[PDB]
Amino acid sequence: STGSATTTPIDSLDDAYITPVQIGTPAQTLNLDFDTGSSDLWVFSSETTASEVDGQTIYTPSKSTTAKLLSGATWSISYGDGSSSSGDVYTDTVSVGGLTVTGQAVESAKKVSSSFTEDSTIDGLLGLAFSTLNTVSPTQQKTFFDNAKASLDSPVFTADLGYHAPGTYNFGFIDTTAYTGSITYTAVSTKQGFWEWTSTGYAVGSGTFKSTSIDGIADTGTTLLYLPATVVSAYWAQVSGAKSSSSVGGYVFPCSATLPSFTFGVGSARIVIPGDYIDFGPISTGSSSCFGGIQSSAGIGINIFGDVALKAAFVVFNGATTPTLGFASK
């Protein structure tokens, strides 16, 4: 089998991407944030504290003839941005772009933190990291990808995120029309439960490539590119007036600037992030200070190849017995 679904930016800045997902019988369609940095499929629901729901579409398990309470199971998660959610668990039929899994754990939120409430466009998350990170207790549950894997034509999914435009998540096949040149594959460590790999270096604009190992994770659920302070300083030093602002919480730059590109290495290959991808607009409405799309990972404890990086590439998440990651230009 295969599946193919379009993913759409939630706003004009590509702060996140939503993909429609069918849950239950008859189908209830929710717009979920596909997140290769976590491993829980959770949704706003009829059980979510009413004051914490503000415009989201909810899953109502009592209206699904295929929903079953997973007795005794609970979940609780907290993300790198400080947000969190928790609740109980049903199993139900879940379909993405024509690909169907029966008996998928659908984690129903009883509580969500303010940042989820305040974002009316995201109805939940669909985790695509390794199932060892799933938070369901006392019986850990599998991700949608892990449940689908054996049925797929090939044990892979791909992320093709757009810049200020829709893109595609495919399951079970590689669309050879969706990228240019060849796909370069690189080793993955699953030891922390993430799609963790090592970039071979970087360049700033038209500058020379610096060969240096940069361990990090491929994370579709993180907006920005978080890299070591040395790398980030070298980037922003090429932008007149750019500075790190403790009050704002990162590098800012004059909105009048034209930003240089940023290149990262994948083996002997190179992915180029155009400068415009690194512009996240005014720090507050009407400001002439703009927020940077490349930020320091110091204090996170891990480097994160988030959407800013991933949307410059066609990315293969290869879930074969030994997982690997593939990157192509597009």
CB count within 10 Å of CB 294 equals 23
Distance (Å, whole) CA 42 – CA 66:
17
For residue 189, what is the DSSP state?
B
Between 108 and 222, CB nearer to ligand Cc1ccccc1N: 222
Distance (Å, whole) CA 266 – CA 316:
13
Q: Are 111 and 37 in contact (CB under 8 A)?
A: no
Between 124 and 172, CB nearer to ligand Cc1ccccc1N: 124
Rounded to an integer, what is the distance from CA 12 to the centroid of its chain?
Answer: 17
CB of 195 to ligand Cc1ccccc1N, least distance (A): 10
Kindly name the residue from 38, 45, 108, 199 that is annotated as catalytic. 199
Kindly name the residue from 35, 92, 119, 146 that is annotated as catalytic. 35
3-state class of 310 per DSSP?
helix
Task: Name the residue whose CB lies closest to ligand Cc1ccccc1N.
Answer: 80
Note if 76 is an active site residue.
no
Between 88 and 119, CB nearer to ligand Cc1ccccc1N: 119
Note if 62 is an active site residue.
no
CB of 223 to ligand Cc1ccccc1N, least distance (A): 10
Distance (Å, whole) CA 25 – CA 291:
43
Place of tokens 């495919």: 170
Between 86 and 100, CB nearer to ligand Cc1ccccc1N: 86
Q: Which residues bind ligand Cc1ccccc1N (CB under 6 A)?
A: 37, 80, 217, 219, 222, 300, 302, 304
CB of 114 to ligand Cc1ccccc1N, least distance (A): 18
CB of 304 to ligand Cc1ccccc1N, least distance (A): 6
- Residue 24 is encoded by which pair of tokens? 């239950």
Q: Where in the sequence numbering do the catalytic residues fall?
A: 35, 199
